[PDB]
Amino acid sequence: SYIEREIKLRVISPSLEEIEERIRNNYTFINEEHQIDIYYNNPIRDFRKSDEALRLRNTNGKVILTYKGPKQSKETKTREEIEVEVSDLHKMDLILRKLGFIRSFQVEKIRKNYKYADFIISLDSIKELGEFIEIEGINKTEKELISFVDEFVKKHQIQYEKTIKSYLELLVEHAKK
Amino acid sequence: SYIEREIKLRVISPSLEEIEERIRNNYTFINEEHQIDIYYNNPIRDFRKSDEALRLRNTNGKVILTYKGPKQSKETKTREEIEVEVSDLHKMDLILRKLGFIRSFQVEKIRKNYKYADFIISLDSIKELGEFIEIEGINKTEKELISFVDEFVKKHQIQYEKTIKSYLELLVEHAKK
Ligand SMILES: [Mg+2]
Ligand SMILES: [Mg+2]
């Protein structure tokens, strides 16, 4: 098992393109990922109730099956996350449907990953939700991550809103209107 | 999807070692696989009732997740089979258990694969069940496969018993006594 702990910011200003310019000198670009996620639900156990998620991701052609458990924090996005790469997205999707899972919703995004010391900064252009930043810390406590994010937004003059909602949950709310 | 069609023989005589000698000249050895399979069940949908199977296989370190559907034939072992390779057995097993699946039983065997024209002959040493042969045909109808197996056992003087039961089912019956 693995505990994924990150902070998610909804960017108000400036654009991600401008933010990319402000970090370009002191942050090292890692890669850009085009991610297409298919989320699933269990008809006999509502994941929206138990705060669980099951996702089949296509990121630059690499196919990843991810389980996510209930949130463990209110101040950061902290969840158990178990991931395995699979050989074929179509077939894995078929197996889930043969086992009784139902496709729920789809999330597509362009993620740009940057590295600063032990932190990973993800600049996220979410289709239909807008611009977001996710920050993760390697071997970092929740206090350290919160502190670094505060320095990050201040140093780069980012107006923002923190949220612990997943992209799947934000998409649903954005679809309400 | 994919329809796996094979004939399974319980070998009465001679030994698989002796059978290996009788086919050695005209059959080409492909590989030998050490296979450790973990079977699963769904508590809300009994696979023993619906004739389904879910298996995580370790074959020479390669990890394969396989769904198998209900049998479609009475004269050969014919089932829908959807397979994907996954990166990590432990993690995939965890995901299944997090999703509610329960490990059912385990099957371990040494499989030796041979090739004759469009047919694959598998000599199987099943731990606790004994010696078996499985024969599969590439682009072969059910009539062709049955006919080839009849020639195969006759040419190599194999005493045998055909069965359409899966190894999981045979293991359960063998455990009854
Ligand atoms: Mg995230
Ligand atoms: Mg078989």
UniProtKB/TrEMBL annotation, chains A, B:
PANTHER family: CYTH DOMAIN-CONTAINING PROTEIN (PTHR21028:SF2), SI:CH211-156B7.4 (PTHR21028). PROSITE patterns: CYTH (PS51707). Pfam families: CYTH (PF01928). Gene3D superfamilies: Hypothetical Protein Pfu-838710-001. InterPro entries: Adenylyl_cyclase_CyaB, CYTH-like_dom_sf, CYTH_domain. It comes from Sulfolobus acidocaldarius (strain ATCC 33909 / DSM 639 / JCM 8929 / NBRC 15157 / NCIMB 11770). Residues 2-173 form the CYTH domain. ATP binds at residues 8, 55, 57, 68, 77, 79, 109, 111, 167. It comes from the Archaea. Ca(2+) 1 binds at residues 4, 6, 134, 136. Mg(2+) binds at residues 6, 134. Keywords: ATP-binding, Calcium, Metal-binding, Nucleotide-binding. Ca(2+) 2 binds at residues 6, 134. This is Conserved Archaeal protein. CDD domains: CYTH-like_AC_IV-like. SMART domains: CYTH (SM01118). GO terms for molecular function: ATP binding; metal ion binding.
